[PDB]
Structure formats: structure tokens, C-alpha cells
Amino acid sequence: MKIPYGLGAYTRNRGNLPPLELINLFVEKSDSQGVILQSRKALVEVADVGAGPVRATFQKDGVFGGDRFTLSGDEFYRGATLLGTVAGGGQARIVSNGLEVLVNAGGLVYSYNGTNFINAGFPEAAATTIAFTGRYFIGLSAGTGEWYFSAVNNGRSWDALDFATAENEPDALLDVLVLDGVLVFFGTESIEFWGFTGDADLPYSPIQQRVFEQGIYATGCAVRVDNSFYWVGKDKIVYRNGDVPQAVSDDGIVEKAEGSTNLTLFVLEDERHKFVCLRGDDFTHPHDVTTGQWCEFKSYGRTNFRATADFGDDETGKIWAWGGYDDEGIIERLFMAGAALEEATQIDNIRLTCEVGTTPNLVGIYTDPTLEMRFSYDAGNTWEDWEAETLGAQGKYRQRVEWRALGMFDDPGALFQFRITDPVSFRLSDVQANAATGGRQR
Amino acid sequence: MKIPYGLGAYTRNRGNLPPLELINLFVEKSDSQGVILQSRKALVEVADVGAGPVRATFQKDGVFGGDRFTLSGDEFYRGATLLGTVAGGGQARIVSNGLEVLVNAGGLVYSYNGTNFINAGFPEAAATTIAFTGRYFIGLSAGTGEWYFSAVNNGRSWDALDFATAENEPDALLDVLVLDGVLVFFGTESIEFWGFTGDADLPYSPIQQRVFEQGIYATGCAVRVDNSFYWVGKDKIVYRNGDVPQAVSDDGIVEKAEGSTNLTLFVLEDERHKFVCLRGDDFTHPHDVTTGQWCEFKSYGRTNFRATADFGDDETGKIWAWGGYDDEGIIERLFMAGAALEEATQIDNIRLTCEVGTTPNLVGIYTDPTLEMRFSYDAGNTWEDWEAETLGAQGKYRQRVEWRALGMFDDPGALFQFRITDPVSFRLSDVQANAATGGRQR
Amino acid sequence: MKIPYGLGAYTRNRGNLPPLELINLFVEKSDSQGVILQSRKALVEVADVGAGPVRATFQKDGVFGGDRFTLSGDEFYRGATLLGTVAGGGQARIVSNGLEVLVNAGGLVYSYNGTNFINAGFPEAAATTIAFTGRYFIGLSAGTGEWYFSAVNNGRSWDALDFATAENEPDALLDVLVLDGVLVFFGTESIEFWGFTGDADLPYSPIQQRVFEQGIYATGCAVRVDNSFYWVGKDKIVYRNGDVPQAVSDDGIVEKAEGSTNLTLFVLEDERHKFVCLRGDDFTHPHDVTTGQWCEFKSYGRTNFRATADFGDDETGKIWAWGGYDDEGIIERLFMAGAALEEATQIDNIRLTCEVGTTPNLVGIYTDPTLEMRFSYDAGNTWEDWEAETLGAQGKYRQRVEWRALGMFDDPGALFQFRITDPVSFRLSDVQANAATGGRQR
Amino acid sequence: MAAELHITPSRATSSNGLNLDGAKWFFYQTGTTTPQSVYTTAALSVAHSNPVVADAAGKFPAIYFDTTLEYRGVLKTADEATTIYDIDPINSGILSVLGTSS
Amino acid sequence: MAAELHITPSRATSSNGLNLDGAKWFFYQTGTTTPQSVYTTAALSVAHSNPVVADAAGKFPAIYFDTTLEYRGVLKTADEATTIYDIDPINSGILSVLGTSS
Amino acid sequence: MAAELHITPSRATSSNGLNLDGAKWFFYQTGTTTPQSVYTTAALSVAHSNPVVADAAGKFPAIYFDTTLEYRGVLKTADEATTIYDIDPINSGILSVLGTSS
């Protein structure tokens, strides 16, 4: 037959629901097989800077030849040169138009040019965010404030009379985003839209009847994923822009986001897989955007998958990319397959259709990966011992992975759990409950 | 029965997926048969110019009587006359309104008239592209720049004060395209739209809220296929214009485009088959536009199917068209047919319904084309020996092509592979797994 | 049973595809029977003028009492009066508002009034087309040109300063069409739209973002069929106006249009059947517009079905209409019925449900029409002898037309072919493969 | 300066231990099943037939390739059946590989 | 321009004239007895198992090396005994020898 | 970067299927019938005898050439008769061909 294996990371603890979940495995389509589970690529080391938690990084091709701008700890690094220091704050941001590279924290705005790095001179003390690059530079004043704007392509000279107040949020302002020629201002209470005017004194004007009522949660909770954007909202429900804002988070992501009092959003780029990660206290649930299914990234030996607004680390000052396998030591990959059964059965067999015997190792302990499975009764509230089967050496492309002496299942549903914790790449297409016995040397 | 043969070129190497693919065969509809595979026409020799890699060609009917303008190597050829030289650059382009023929590289703009060929006098040194013909001539300045425009129908006299800056991309500009009366400017970061004003000082004006966020990859990655156009994007995902930009590339085209650091796009014209080729380091995947299925063109004995922005060669200075057969020596044509099987079977037969015995040869070695097939186990990771059957001589329209002693298939799926490498035209409608034996002399 | 007989004229010679086709038979709906094939009416003689190929004709009811204006050979005929001569050219056109009748060729514009016929005085030498009648007269200058306009309702007095240039096609202009108050100008490269202004100096203005990229093929390739219009395009794919231009030609019409270097379009009026004929070197494929299916009109003993932009002949100077039967001598009518078979069968019978025994002849050789059918093997690449059955005399409304000793069909499909070449009207509703034997004197 | 290794040539033998006679190597192009020529001497002048034959004990004669173009060979018996070997690049390209890459 | 010589491949046979089945080539590193990979295709993509097996008559499949690194091979029977051949540089270095010397 | 093909070495067998013992390869100069040396190791240091012998089953030892100079080999039985093979350029010149031409 064919047992329905779970495609999402659904663990709800309101009731004692059966926790079908994915670990380091996401869903995509194919053409030879129908629906497939694929592995997560291991992490590498690309660029190393001075130690400390990396907060925000930046590099392009048309600015300064491609020099890597980072904010590690409390101070810059342009390559390995020190370039002064930054005041302390909450969330960082790097803005540039090619002739000058700005930076931010909760405290101050620091500009840069060919050889100097001093204060840009924001028209008051504090600042929240800076967004825009191509024509102006737009800053957000902390507290009950407005947004200021500089001169054309000149972030080193601000002005006090160049501002524009908002008229719908009395509490604060937290984030700003450039979606089109228009602007998007995130309040703590409402969301406004401000189009481009084309004047000299005031260059922007509001759109009248476009106000969303779900204000942003914090200062780092808005990502331009696509032609439109995402945010988090005053409550922990990740939304999506449209005619009306629709919601993409369901149960089991919403009730888990309350325990973390810190929530961020960022993208991770894969080849046509734009993940949208929701980083919290320990979890990291990336919402895939092409086939929209929640999954779970978890790095080994730690409390959370290490990442930030880019591929930087949260510790020791490291930046990487995706590449290869066998670099992070152990990559755990776990999936679920259940029956929702009602009558007493005789499960004589269980079967996987994975990729078989393509490990590149011949010396060492990883010449046979040996995944292992685990029975359960009573909807996964208690478990049984592991049963491990090998995956074969290299070149043995014909090796069935099966278990043959399972027994009886008197349950509201038989519920299995598979795991491989090993640097070998892993694939899965289908499972089979009961099959027959034919063969020619396999 | 009827075995599902593959309609696309799906070879993904993330997992060890079964690689069903087409070689020199594309899919179209019909009315007598349902769905058909058809061959690729052989290449000819039409016009020959001086040697070197042909970069860009041009001919029409309402300009200069139809004289073939080409850029072979480092210098022009108008027919066989030399017409000066061109500076070195990245991607070429030929623009004309009938009274003057421009050209470009990465370096300079060279105009032409009845008898002279000298510098057009771009208002600064470098240039990226020229597009427009009918009213103005529009040039793109290299670096962090804008676009300049000439006088009406006068490409030989530019001006320094005739420009218009952009306001959304700070990095660069790479490509320009004339879709309608409007213009389309491809930045490295965003895509803008600029309509036609009708003034004298500034003749173009922007459209406010139409900004796409996927900037072009390079300078040669935008093709006006249809009423709308295509591009490649900052990542390797070929898009398509609409209300929102949708994507047309899937897995197995995206992960293969990373290995090539050079990507182009062009059209090949067939009778109601507008192919859109993605040329890379070795591959050429043409996206058909009427029945949108990826396939693969591969010329023999080489590393890539030889073509450019038109039917010119990448070597020795040759230009052709489509015509006939038996010109390129050997044309390989390969397709796949698989079962996705689960139980042990007895495949006693396999059958093709092709076109049979219509070769025009009577002398020589090609009087019997003799295609050949190949078994596989273990999802195509290893293969078996060929089994060849003839196709019959000319006039024998009744010849079944079958194999009769196959055996047992204990697999996740039986998976076959057929090939004919021969100048005879080839057709395929259906296959049959198991059939019966009737007949009257066939 | 019921064998699917073909409804279109599908003959593709890319592969050696089974050529199901219609000859002088088109498809319409009904209510008593479901789907029916009906005959083509014979041609008559209505008006005869001086000899030569008729190029363009014209008559109405509100101009000059209804006098037939024709251009036979090189000179007019108003009835049988000579009315001067015309210069030589490519495609003719007759334009009138009631007080004056214009004409054209590739060369000159000739006006007319109550008693005089002299030169209208186009503001330069050559002209391509004239369209508009009710307010102005609009002419198209040959070469790289624009369109001129005359005074109000005065085609005999043009002016040199009355013109308006185009801004998107640099090559040429070929055709013009009045669809609404707006105008449609066909370039060799693009298609423009020009609305009505209401001024005195310049009376027309362009629509900004409506540009089609498929320019017309020649000067006679645009027909106002309906509320919208058709054209042919730079390649041989007949299109159709809409939001975006969709295509109506498929394979087997496109690959046949390349062999003819001359392509025209016109309408033939039937009672609620507006045919759109594509005339070429030998073919004439009329696209029906209500039930859109391609068919084929072929006159006997010749190389092409004789017609032009109206019902005029291409030779000897004749004009007709539709009427009756038994006028053109022999009308061939041919249709196809195939099985797409896979297993060896025993076809013991074959059956038609036609109209039976309604011939009006009692003397002569046509008292029994006697259609005949023809076997085939090997997808129609070779055939067999005819088997003829009579249709019965007049008044015998009960006569089955069947063949009883067919035999075995070991094929990729049994494939039959029927033909009647006889002035009797012909109908077909259904066919039957195997039937039973009941009856009372029939 | 470098050591070239020697391999003793074999005979055309069947699935059993017995020797075969009249075995035929068919030499082709790269992957196309179109016949190419095979030369008999140290130089590249005299080409013998493309279906070669062996002796009564299964001795093939001296077989030399042209290293600027690829090859493909099979084995058949006298009745044109029971394909023994099939090797798709049966030649090792010395000049044709170094001339296109490396 | 140059003539490449052809050698017909043999079977795995014992000390007598009989053929062996299940014979195993063990391919190693240069002199270290550490297992390396051996590829099955014209390219260097798909690597089959390092202990290879033959057919019931002693047919080994298509065996291709990587010429930028040395090899060493042996033969054993099914019972892992009676070492038939042992050749220490069993590969002939085309690129790996010209890249270090000459 | 390039694929080197493998050929299993054969034994010294007669016209029948039986194996021969004491078979002798005589290695010569290019075409002159003058004896040259044949080395036994991976390097080019220790040269064994030019008339080589096989085992009781027909196993020849590891035979290595010197690629800067041509060779020519034959086969004989123990009684110095019944010449089995004779190949005039039995070596494939890697360095000696590229050093004079190409």
C-alpha cells in the first residue's frame, strides 16, 4: 500500500495531538517522482571577521568593488580593517547608494565615504531604521516621531526642517520598507502607504484609503520576500500582502511563538526556494514560499539553527553560504509516517523508497549510514526501541530498506518515526506498508 | 498497454532521481494522433563571411535592399566588404531606422550612412546597449549612469544635455527593450517602465507604481518573445511578464544554470514554434512557448549546440537557417520511457509506433537506420547493453519495431532508453508494453 | 458502433501522419441530428464584363442606383462602358462615399463623378491603399512614408501639408483598415491604433499603449470579418484581434503556407457562415468563424478554387454568386473516417447515414450518383481499389449504403476514404462499423 | 623517464573455456553506430576491413587506432549474435583529449 | 597522427583452463592499501563498488580510472584467497606524471 | 580529468584451450632483432632477463617498458618454436612520439 507521510511540521500541544514533524527536510515537486522530501545542505565557512555576534552584513558588485561590510560585535569590519565603532542598539541595518555606506543601531547614524568614517548628523539624537538608497536617505526618529529625509544622494548632510509627520499612529514607529516607488511605514497600531510626489520641498504623499490594522510587533519583523512583503503583526500571526492581508501561520506555529519574547524574520536563498525563517528563542520555522509548507531547520548540539538577517552567525563572527555535505559533522533529518488506523491489523513489513548507496566515503566510520526507525503506540506519547537498518556501501544501488517482524497495532493509529544523523545526502519519494517478494540479487 | 514516455528534459542531480530527458525532440499537438514527438531539422549553410565568432547579425527588406550586416570577429562585413572595425566588448547589438545602421560593443557607438563609417559621437566614452529605431536612438551609459537620446532620426549627432536619470537603481544599468510605445529599463536591482510623453525637451516619463524587484543578471538576458517579454533575474530563474512576474523554470534547469557563469537568451524561429533558448557553458535548453515544455538541443561532436542571437555560428563566421536533413552528418535523438513500477512483472514485449521506412537513401550505409534501445535497473544509475532493431528500407511502410525476450523487472521502476543517430526523419506517437500477435505480411 | 470521422483538414507532412481531410465539405450544428457534414453550393454566372483577371469589384444600393464597378484586366467597366484605364500595380481597392468612386493599384489614385474620370491628384506619385469613405479619404504613400488625408467628402482635391507621420515603424506601411471610429494601420513591423480627434487641422490621434508586434505580411492580408478583424503576420500564422492577439492557424496550415510566396485573405458569405479564405499558390483553406474548423474548397480541373476579394474570377472577367447545383459540371466531395485501431479485428460491414435518393435527374447519366470508397493500410501511405455503391433513383428514400466483405485490419489504424464527384447534393450525419440486419423492403 | 605497463593480449573465448573462431570486432564512431576504419600497420596507411575475423583458434591481427578520433567496439560470433563485450570509449584519447581540454 | 594499439580484454581464469566466477578486483591507493573509487562510465561521475564482481563466466564490466591519481589492483576468488595478480602501478599516468615531471 | 581504460591481463595459452608454461617473451629493438632490457619495478632501476618465463599456469610477472624508446615482442614455447604473437610497435610511445613530432 502507501502510508501518508507528513509534509509539514505540525506539533500542537493544546491537546495531546500526534506530533508529525519535519527536521531539516523540505517539500518540493518533481516530474519523475510525484512528491519528494529533500535534505538540507550543510554549512561551510566563507568569510571570517573579528569575533562577536554578527548583526548585519552587506556586499554588492557595483559598490567599492565588492568589499564585505559587516557589523561584528560593537565595531565594523571592511574586510579586516577596523573602521571605528558603533553605539549599542537593538537591530542593525546597512544602507548604501554606491558613494556612501550608512549603518544604524538603536542609537545613531554613521556615514562613510572613500576614507572617512564619522557621524552623519541625524537631526536629533536617536534613530530606528534607514531604508532608501537611490534618491534620498530616510531615517526614523525614535519615540513618538516622524520620518526625516536628507538631500539628494547626500547622507552626510541632514536638515531639521525636512520631515513629514504621520496622522494615524499615536504610539510609535518601528520599521520602514521600500516595496516600489511607494513606501511602507509600519506603526505599532496601523500600516500606512506613502507614494512618490515629485516635488522638491515634500517629495512624498499618502494614499488615502489604504490602512491595515495589524501593526508590526517589533523593529525587525518585515521582509520583502517577493513582489510583495510579509510581517508579524501585533499578535503572533505572520501575514501576507494582497488586496486584504491574508494569514499564513496556522496552529502549532502561533502558540509556539508566544514563549519567545523575541521574533525576527529573514530570507534564506536556495535555488528557486525562497525560505522565510521565523527565528525565536529556540525554534526556526522557515515558511517555504513556492510550495507553502512549514518545516524546521535545526543545527546540532545547540539550542537553535544559527543564522541572522543574512548567512552570518550569531556568535564568533562568521559568514557562510550553502555548500556540499560533511562539514557540520552531524546533520539530523527526521520525518513522520502515520496511519490514523481504526481496526486491529497485522503489519508484517514496512518499506522506504529512498536514495540508496551513494555515499562517497570508503575510509572512516561513515561507509554505511544506517538510519533507524521507532515504533509507537498511544499517539506518540510514548515510544519504543530503535530498529536500525543499513543503507549499503558505495555502488550498491539495489538495497531494499525494510523491517519484517513488526506485529499488531491496536491503536487510534500506528505512528512511526525515522531518523538519519549522518553527512550522507538523503531523499525520500514513497513508503509502502505491505509489499510482495520478488527479486534478482537485491 | 501504454507506457508514459517523458515529455520534458528533467535531469535533477540533487537526489539521484531518474533522469528522463529529451534530446533534439520537442512536443507538439496534432489531430490524427493525440500527442507526438517530432525531430529537429538539420542545419545548412546560407551565408558565409570572414572568419571569427559571429556576435550579432541583421538584415531586413526595407533597408538598403536587404544587405546582410554582420559583426564577425572584430570587424564588420556588409556582404563581403570590410567596413572598418569595432572596439572590443561584451555583447553586440545592431540598430537601424533605414537611413543609418548603428552597432555597439562594450566600448563605442559607430554609425553608418550611404558611404561613410565613422564614430557617432556618444556624449561620453562607453556604452552598453542601443535599442530604439523609429523616432530616437537611445544609448545606455556604462557605470552608474542614465540613458541619453539623440535628435529625431539622427544617430550621428548626440548631445550632452539630452539625458534623463533613473531614481531607483543605484548600482548600474544593463539592458533596455522596446515593448510598446513604452520602454523597459533593466537595472541590476529593479525594473522600471517609462512611457512616451510627446514633448520636445524630455520625451519620456515614468509610470509610478510599476517596479519589479528581480533585476537582470547580465547585459544579454532579455528577449521580446511575444506580446510580452522574458528575462533571467538576479538568480537563475527565467521569468515572464504579466500582472505579476511568474516563473517558468523549474528544478533541473535552475540548479544547472549555476555552473555556467555566462547566460544568454535568444529566439529560434520555427513554423509556429517560438523557442526561447537558454545558452550556457555546455547546455542549451529551449523553452517552447506554445506548449510550454523544456527540451534540449545538442549538436554532435561538440560541447554545445552552436547558435547565437540569430542563426549565426559561434566560430568560423557562418550563418544558416533550418532546412532538410542529412547535412550535419549525425543528428542524435533520444527519449525516455519508464513505468514507476512496484511489483515483479513479466515484460515479454515492447513496442514503438514510429514512422517506418521512409528513408530516401538507396546507396550508402544509411539504407536502414537501425535505432537501438537499452535496459536499466536501479533508476538509471547503471545500464545494460544495446538491443538494435532495423527500421526497414524505403517503401516498406509495414514494419513493427519490437523486442521480444526482455525478462523480469524487480525495481522501483523499469526504465528504458531509445536512440537513433542518423539523418532520417523520426516521429513517435505511442508505445505499447504488451500487445498481441495478428498480421498479414508485416 | 460509430467510427469518428474527421471534422478538419489536417494534412501534415512533417512526419508521415495520417492525412484526414475535407474537400468541399464544412461542419455545422443541427438539432435533429447532432453534428453534420454539408455540401458546397455550385457556382453560377451573374454578371459578365470584359475579359482579363478581375482584381476588385464593388456595388451597393445607395450609390449610383447600383451600377457594378469592376476592374477587369487593365481598365474599368461600369456595366459595359469602358471608363478609361488604370496603371499597373499589386492589389486593387475601390472606395466610395456616394458622390465619387475612387480606385487604386500600386501606382495612382483615380477619382470619378457624374461624367468625368481623371486623376485625383495624390500629393506625390505612388499610393498603396485607400480606406475611409464617410468623412475623409485616407491614402497611404509608398516607401518609408505616412498617410495623407483629403478635405471633407472631396477626394478630387488633396493637399501637401495634410499628413501625419508614424513613430514606431521605420521600414514601410502596407495596409489600413477602418474598424470603428478608430483606424488600424498595419506596418511591416508593428500595428498601431489611431482614434478620432474632432479637430480641423489634424483629425486623428494615437492610442498610447496599444501596439501589436506582428506586422502584416503583404498589402492584401487584412480582413474585417466581424466586430474585430484578422491578419496574417510577419510569419505565416493567421491571428485574431482581442485583448492580446490569439492565433487560429495550427500545424498543417502553417507549414503549407510557406510554399506559396503570395498570400491573400477575403470573405465568402454564406447564410450565417462567414468563411475566411486563405488563398495561396494552389490551396484555399477557408476558416469558418461560427464553428471554427478548417476545411478545403477545390474547384475541378484546375489548380485552385477560383475566387478573389469578392466572387469575381481570376480569369476571363466573370462575377457570380452561390446558387443551386449542376452548373460547374463536377463537384468533388471527399471525407475521411478512421479508427486508430490497435488489435486485429473482423470488420464485416461499414455503413453511412447520408441523404438518399433525392436526385432531380431522370434523363442523362446522373440518375444514380454512385459514390465509392477505398480501403487503406499503413496510415494512408498506400491505398487499394475503389468499391462503389449506388445511391438510388429518385423517390427511393430507403436505401442502405453498405459494403459487406471487408476483412481483417492489422494496423496502427484502419483508415477509409469516401468520394462522390457528382452534382447531387450530399449530406452525412453518422457512420456505423458493425450493425445488425432487420428490415421491411429497404 | 616514465614506465609504460604491458598487458598480454587475449583470445576470443566463449562463456565456457573453449576458444571461438570467426569472432568479429565491429568498430564504430563515438556513439553513433557508423563504421570507421582500422589500420593494420605501425603507420596509418593501409586499412583492413571493419568486420575483422580471427583465426581458427581466435587470434586477432595487429589492430591500430587513430588517436585523433574516438572509437567504439563490440564482439559477435560467426552467426552475428551473443554480444560479448561493448565498450563505448574503447580508445584512450591521447591527442584528441589534450587538444580540446587540458 | 599517432597509432594507438588495441588489446582484447581477457576473462578471470584459474590455474587450469577453466573460467572463474565472482572474482574480485580490489583497487587501492598507490602503495598504502586504502580503498579508492572506480567509475563505470565514459565520464567520471558514477562510481561503482570497489570490490567488483564478474559474471558467471568471468566478465568484468567497463572499468575506468582517474588519470590524475595512481592505483593498485589485485585479484581474489570468491573465498577471498589465491591472489592471482598484483600490480603496484596498475594505472599508466598520463596527466599525473607530466604534471610533476617532464 | 580523463578516463583511463582497464584491460585484464591474460595467460599464455596454446591453439587449444589449455594453458602453456615456460612461454618466452623476447623483447627487441624497433625492427632490428637486437635485445633490449625490460624492468621489473615501478621505477626503471632493476631489469630482469630479456627471455622471460612464466609460471606453471602461464603467469607472466610485472613487465614495464621505458617510454622514450620503442620495443618489439614475440612469443615462443619452451622448445623455441610456434611463434604465437608478433607485434612490431608493441609499445605505445607517450614521450618518444611527442618529442619528435606533434
Distance in Å, alpha carbon of F10 to nearest chain E alpha carbon: 5
Residue B281 is which amino acid? D
What is the length of chain D?
102
Nearest-angstrom CA–CA distance, B349 and C173: 61
Interchain contact, D8 vs F4, CB within 8 Å: no
Supply the DSSP string of B329-353, one letter for each residue. Answer: S--EEEEEEE----S-EEE--EEEE
Best E21, E26, E40, E49 member to test A by mutation, with max A CBs in 10 Å, is E49
**CB atoms near residue C257 (< 10 Å):** 22
State the chains in contact with C (3 or more Cβ–Cβ pairs under 8 Å): B
Partners of residue D32 in chain B, C-beta under 8 Å: 300, 330, 332, 421-422
Bridge partners, residue C261, by sequence: none
Report residue B373 as a C-alpha cell. 534501445
Dihedral sign, Cα of residue A263, residue A265, residue A270, residue A273: positive
Rounded CA-CA distance C118/C124 in Å is: 16
Chain B residues near residue D34 by CB distance under 8 angstroms? 330, 365, 421
Q: Is E18 on the interface with F (CB under 8 A)?
A: no
Do A325 and A41 meet the contact criterion of CB atoms below 8 Å apart?
Answer: yes
For residues C73 and C85, give the distance between their C-alpha atoms in angstroms, rounded to a whole number: 9
Continuous H helices in A103-201: none
C-alpha cell at B427: 516521429
Cα separation, B174 vs B128, in Å, equals 7
Helices (H) and strands (E) in chain D — how many of each? 1, 7
CA distances from C59 to A212, A336, C95, C311 (A): 66, 81, 11, 12
Classify residue B378 by its DSSP letter. G
In terms of DSSP bridges, do strands C147-149 and C138-140 run parallel, antiparallel, or are they unpaired? Answer: antiparallel
CA C54-C56-C61 angle, 5° bins = 120
Q: Contact at 8 Å (CB) between A188 and A141?
A: no
Chain B residues touching residue E48 (CB < 8 angstroms)? 382
Kindly provide the residue ranges of all beta strands, DSSP E only, lying in D10-77, ordered along the sequence. Answer: 24-28, 38-39, 47-48, 64-66, 72-76
CA distance B62 to B98: 7
**CA-wise closest residue to A50 among A84, A77, A86:** A77
Residues 6 or more apart in contact with residue A300 via CB below 8 angstroms: A328, A329, A330, A331, A332, A421
Sequential DSSP letters for A272-297: TEEEEEEE-SS-EEEEESSS--B---
CB contact under 8 A, E15 and F92: no
SS3 assignment, position B379: helix
Identity of residue C159: D
Nearest Cα residue to C415 out of C2, C1, C3: C3
Measured between CB atoms, which of A134, A195, A227 is closest to B168?
A134
Q: For residues E31 and F41, what is the distance between their CA atoms, to the nearest angstrom?
A: 13
Nearest to C299 by CA among C43, C29, C85, C18: C43
What's the burial of F45, exposed, middle or buried (CB within 10 Å: 0-12/13-18/19+)?
exposed
Q: What DSSP state is assigned to residue A41? A: P
- Which of B17, B167, B168 is nearest residue A30 as measured by Cβ atoms? B17
B381 neighbourhood in chain E, CB within 8 Å: 46
**E 42-61 near D (Cβ less than 8 A):** 42, 56-57, 59
Coil, strand or helix: which one is F26? strand
Contacts of B380 (CB under 8 A, 6+ apart): B18, B19, B415, B417
Q: Is the CB of F16 less than 8 angstroms away from the CB of D57? A: yes
Is the CB of residue C321 less than 8 Å from the CB of residue C311?
Answer: yes
How far, in Å, CA of B209 to CA of A228, rounded? 13
Say how far apart CA B312 and CA B292 lie, in whole Å.
25
- At residue E95, what are phi and psi to the nearest 5 degrees? -95, -30
The span from the CA of B125 to the CA of B112, in Å, is: 19
- B35 DSSP β-pair partners: B29
Given a contact cutoff of 8 angstroms between Cβ atoms, the answer to whether C284 and C295 are in contact is no
> Do the beta carbons of residue C403 and residue C350 sit within 8 Å?
yes
Q: Residue A107: helix, strand or coil by DSSP?
A: coil
Compute the distance between CA of residue B4 and CA of residue F74 in angstroms, rounded to an integer: 57
Which amino acid type is present at position C3?
A: I
Phi, psi for D50 (deg, rounded to 5): -75, -45
Nearest CA in chain D to F64: D5
The residue with cell 568479429 is D24
- Adjacent-strand bridge partners of B240: B246
b/e per residue A2-37 (b: at least 16 CB within 10 A): ebebbbbbbbbeeeeebbbbbbbbbbbebbbbeebb
Yes or no: say if B185 and B158 are a contact pair by the CB < 8 Å rule.
Answer: no
H or E element in which residue D95 lies: helix D95-98
Decide if A186 contacts A231 (C-beta within 8 A).
yes
3 state SS of B416: strand
Query: What angle is formed at CA C194 by the lines to CA C191 and CA C195, rounded to 5 degrees?
Result: 145
Burial category of B404 from C-beta neighbours within 10 Å (exposed 0-12, middle 13-18, buried 19 and up): exposed
Return the residue in D33, D86, D100 with the most chain B beta carbons within 10 A, the one to mutate for interface testing.
D33
Alpha-carbon gap, residue A309 to A58, rounded angstroms: 10
Instruction: Write the single-letter amino acid at A94.
Output: I
CA distance A335 to A8: 9
CA distance linking residue B339 with residue C65, whole number of Å: 75
CA distance C252 to A322: 50
Q: Do A219 and A198 contact (CB within 8 A), yes or no?
A: no
Q: Kindly list the distances between the CA atom of residue B424 and the CA atoms of B25, B394, C16, in Å, as whole numbers in the listed order.
A: 14, 11, 12
The strand pairing partners of A354, in sequence order, are A428
Exposure b/e, D40-74, CB count within 10 A at least 16 = b: eebebeeebeeebebeebbbbebbbbbbeebbbbb
CA–CA distance, A148 with A159 (Å, rounded to integer): 8
Could you tell me if B331 and B421 are in contact, meaning their C-beta atoms sit under 8 angstroms apart?
yes
- Torsion, CA A416, CA A422, CA A424, CA A426, rounded to 10: 20
The set of cell numbers assigned to F51 is 627471455
Distance CA A92, CA A310 (A): 12
> Could you tell me if E10 and D10 are in contact, meaning their C-beta atoms sit under 8 angstroms apart?
yes
> Which residues share a beta bridge with B260?
none
Question: What residues form DSSP beta bridges with A43?
Answer: A322
The answer to whether C105 touches C140, Cβ cutoff 8 Å, is no
Task: Give the other-Cβ count within 10 Å of A38's Cβ.
Answer: 23
Residue D78 touches chain F, beta carbons under 8 Å: no
In terms of Cα–Cα distance, which of A202, A213, A124 is closest to A169? Answer: A213
E6 CB neighbours in chain D (<8 A) are: 63-65, 90
Alpha-carbon span F22 to F26, nearest angstrom: 12
Q: Which three cell numbers stand for residue C115?
A: 461624367
Cβ neighbors of B44 (< 8 A, separation 6 or more) are B320, B321, B322, B323, B324, B327
In our burial notation (b when 16+ CB lie closer than 10 A, e otherwise), range A291-330 reads eebbbbbbbeeeebbbbbbbbbbeeebbbbeeeebbebee
This PDB structure is determined at a resolution in Å of 4.0
Taking the C-alpha atoms of residue C184 and residue C192, their distance in angstroms, rounded to an integer, is 6
Distance CA D42, CA F31 (A): 11
Selection from C303, C297, C237 nearest residue C267 by Cα: C297
Give CA–CA dist E45/E67, Å, rounded. 14
Q: d(Cα C35, Cα B123) in Å, to the nearest integer?
A: 69
Nearest CB neighbour to E10, from listed F8, F41, F90: F8
Q: What is the 3-state secondary structure (H, E, C) of chain C?
A: CCCCECCCCCCCCCCCCCCCCCECCEEEECCCCCEEEECCCCECCCEECCCCCEEEEECCCCCCCCCCEEEECCEEEECCECCCCCCCCCCCEEEECCCCEEEECCCCEECCCCCCCCECCCCCCCCCCECCCCCCCEEECCCCCCEEECECCECCCCCCCCEECCCCCCCCEEEEEECCCCEEEEECCCEEEEEECCCCCCCEEECCCCCECCCCCCCCCEECCCCCCEECCCCCCCEECCCCCEECCCCCCCCCCCCCCCCEEEEEEECCEEEEEEECCCCEEEEECCCCCECCCCCCCCCCCCCCCCCECCCCCEECCECCCCCCCCCEEEEEEECCCCCCEEECCEEEEECCCCCCCCCCCCCCCCCEEEEEEHHHCEEEEEEECCCCCCCCCCCCEEECCCEEECCCCCEEEEEEECCCCCEEEEEECCCCCCCCCC
Residues of E with CB under 8 A from a CB of B: 40, 46, 48
Q: Which residues contact B227 (CB under 8 A, 6 or more apart)?
A: C212, C213, C244, C245
Sheet containing A54-58: give its strands across.
Answer: A54-58, A69-72, A75-78
Cell output for F30: 624497433
Which amino acid does the sequence have at A357? G
**CA C296 to each of CA B285, C223, C270, C334, C423: distance values in angstroms, whole numbers, following the listed order:** 38, 19, 15, 10, 18
Residues on chain B touching A397 (C-beta within 8 angstroms): 377-379, 381-382
Q: 10 Å Cβ neighbour count for B93?
A: 23
Classify residue B134 as left (phi > 0), alpha (psi -120 to 50) or beta: alpha
C-alpha cell of A104? 544604524
- Beta-carbon neighbour count of residue C27 at 10 Å? 19
Q: What is the DSSP letter of D98?
A: H
- Among A338, A366, A375, A349, CA closest to A425: A366
**Region class of A395: left (phi > 0), else alpha (psi between -120 and 50), else beta:** left
Q: What are phi and psi of B279, to 5 degrees?
A: -90, 135
Write the single-letter amino acid at F87. I
Residues C379 and C11: their CA atoms lie apart, in Å, by 12
Cβ distance A235 to A245 under 8 Å?
no
Q: Strand B35-38 and strand B26-29: pairing?
A: antiparallel
CA torsion, ordered B383, B388, B391, B393, to nearest 10 deg: 150
Asked if C171 and C189 touch (Cβ cutoff 8 Å), the reply is yes
CA distance A263 to A285: 11
The residue of C250, C253, C383, C417 whose CB has the most chain B CBs within 10 angstroms, and thus the best one to mutate to test that interface, is C250
Q: Which of B420, B418, B422 has the alpha carbon at shortest distance from B403?
A: B418
The 10 Å Cβ neighbour count of residue A244 is 7
Contact B171, B144 (CB under 8 A): yes
